[PDB]
Amino acid sequence: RECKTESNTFPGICITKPPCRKACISEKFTDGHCSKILRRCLCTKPC
Amino acid sequence: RECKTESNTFPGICITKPPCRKACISEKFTDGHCSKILRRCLCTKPC
Ligand SMILES: CCCCCCCC(=O)OC[C@H](COP(=O)(O)O[C@@H]1[C@H](O)[C@H](O)[C@@H](OP(=O)(O)O)[C@H](OP(=O)(O)O)[C@H]1O)OC(=O)CCCCCCC
Numbered sequence: 001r002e003c004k005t006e007s008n009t010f011p012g013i014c015i016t017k018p019p020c021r022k023a024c025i026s027e028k029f030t031d032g033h034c035s036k037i038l039r040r041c042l043c044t045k046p047c
Numbered sequence: 048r049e050c051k052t053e054s055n056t057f058p059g060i061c062i063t064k065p066p067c068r069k070a071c072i073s074e075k076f077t078d079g080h081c082s083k084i085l086r087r088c089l090c091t092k093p094c
C-alpha cells in the first residue's frame with residue numbers, strides 16, 4: 001500500500017504522469033499519477 | 048487534505064466507522080472510516 005492524497009500545486013488537467021509526478025516530488029512525496037476518471041493529480045509516498 | 052491508505056489489519060466488511068477508526072489508530076494513523084462503495088477500511092493521517 002501507499003499513502004495517497006491530491007496534489008496541492010499541480011495546475012491543469014492531469015493528462016500524462018510525469019508532470020504530476022514532478023509536482024508531487026516537489027511537495028515531498030515520492031511519486032504521483034493521474035486519477036483515472038476525474039484526472040486529478042494524486043501524490044503517493046510510503047506510509 | 049489527508050494522506051489515506053487501506054488498513055492492513057481491519058478484518059471483515061467495513062459497516063460502521065468506530066471499529067475501522069480503532070484498527071487504523073492501532074496502525075499509527077489518526078483516524079479511519081469505511082470506503083463508500085467497496086466498504087474497505089481506509090486509514091488517514093496528516094501528510
Ligand atoms: C454511481 C456513481 C458513484 C459515485 C461515487 C464514485 C466514487 C467517486 O466519485 O470518486 C472517484 C470516482 C472515480 O475517481 P477517479 O477515477 O478520478 O479516481 C480514482 C478513485 O479515487 C479510486 O477509488 C482510486 O483507487 P483507491 O480507492 O485509492 O484504491 C484511484 O486511485 P489510483 O488507483 O489511481 O491510485 C483513483 O484514480 O469519481 C467518479 O466516480 C466520478 C463519476 C463521474 C460521473 C458519475 C455519475 C454521473
Ligand SMILES: CCCCCCCC(=O)OC[C@H](COP(=O)(O)O[C@@H]1[C@H](O)[C@H](O)[C@@H](OP(=O)(O)O)[C@H](OP(=O)(O)O)[C@H]1O)OC(=O)CCCCCCC
Pocket residue numbers: 037051081082083084085086087089
Ligand atoms: C461513469 C462511471 C464511472 C465511475 C464509477 C465510479 C468509479 C470509482 O471510482 O469508484 C471507486 C470504487 C471504490 O470507491 P469507494 O467508494 O469504495 O472509495 C472511495 C473512493 O476511493 C474515493 O475516490 C475516495 O475519495 P477521494 O478520491 O479520496 O476524495 C473516497 O474516500 P473518502 O471520501 O471516503 O475518504 C472513498 O470512500 O472503485 C471502482 O471504481 C470499482 C467499483 C465500481 C463502482 C461502480 C461501477 C459499476
